[PDB]
Write a protein that binds this ligand. Structure first.
Ligand code: PLM
Lengths: 10, 261
């Protein structure tokens, strides 16, 4: 649901 | 031990945020002097010099300003994500919980740190190269004139606390590491991480501000004030989304606001 955040977190 | 945790968090803050309070104060005191935006003429001049691509073709001034607001927020969320990953303990968390903590914490942290580029007359923008006046923002048509004034009001009282970057970095870490966010999976572990950071903040304020014996509870209250400020801001952003077709919302910010409050 938060794909940009999840990407940023990696 | 805890002095070292405080220093690690301060170093992570200095590395990851493009603006800090020392940098801002050097600029606000008076190379690369800030261009003052106080009226429509100077807004359009500043746009041509500082965001040229945005005006090379145009939509109302208020919608262009709001686009620049969101671009700034997108950049600060990216900085906050890196800062968070450098917070001792954050990266051991479940990735789902990392997302949740950032989702609810970034705008509280944004408005806390915005105080560092604000004074009673205006605020620094565009990586320190513009200064937009508070009165000009008040002059915009509704609803856009209602975005920034509550943030200036928060900032004037926050800045009267006379925090420095070593305090603010711990305050921002405490904002992020908050165990009562909705939807957390491992509440107990997050509460223990929060207790650790808040303990470091408490000890740091005792050392760095021996003159203000209530500074730690003042800052706990500012955290609660920020949560309310963000709830209200999100409500305004929803009004803008629904009634202002030209004011598209950036996808990272849509993801953050969606199901937030
Ligand atoms: C010529 C550039 C003008 C830019 C003036 C506006 C920059 C303001 C930056 C702080 C914005 C804080 C409000 C955030 C809004 C949001 O993301 O929901």
């Amino acid at each position: 649901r938060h794909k940009i955040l999840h990407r940023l977190l990696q | 031990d805890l002095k070292s945790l405080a220093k690690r968090i301060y170093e992570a803050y200095l590395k990851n945020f493009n603006m800090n309070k020392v940098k801002a104060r050097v600029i606000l005191s008076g190379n690369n002097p800030p261009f003052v935006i106080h009226d429509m003429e100077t807004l359009c001049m500043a746009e041509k010099t500082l965001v040229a691509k945005l005006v090379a073709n145009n939509k109302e001034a208020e919608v262009r300003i709001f686009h620049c607001c969101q671009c700034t927020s997108v950049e600060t969320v990216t900085e906050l994500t890196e800062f968070a990953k450098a917070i001792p303990g954050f990266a051991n968390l479940d990735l789902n919980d990392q997302v949740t903590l950032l989702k609810y914490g970034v705008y509280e942290a944004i408005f806390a740190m915005l105080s560092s580029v604000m004074n009673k007359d205006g605020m620094l923008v565009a990586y320190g190269n513009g200064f937009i006046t508070r009165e000009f923002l008040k002059s915009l048509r509704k609803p856009f004139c209602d975005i920034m004034e509550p943030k200036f009001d928060f900032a004037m009282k926050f800045n009267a606390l006379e925090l420095d970057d070593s305090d603010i970095s711990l305050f921002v870490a405490a904002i992020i590491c908050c165990g009562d966010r909705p939807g957390l999976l491992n509440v107990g572990h997050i509460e223990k991480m929060q207790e650790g950071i808040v303990h470091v903040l408490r000890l740091h304020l005792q050392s760095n501000h021996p003159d203000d014996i209530f500074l730690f509870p003042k800052l706990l209250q500012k955290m609660a004030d920020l949560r309310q400020l963000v709830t209200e801001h999100a409500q305004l952003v929803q009004i803008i989304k629904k009634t202002e077709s030209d004011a598209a919302l950036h996808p990272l910010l849509q993801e953050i606001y969606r199901d937030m409050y």
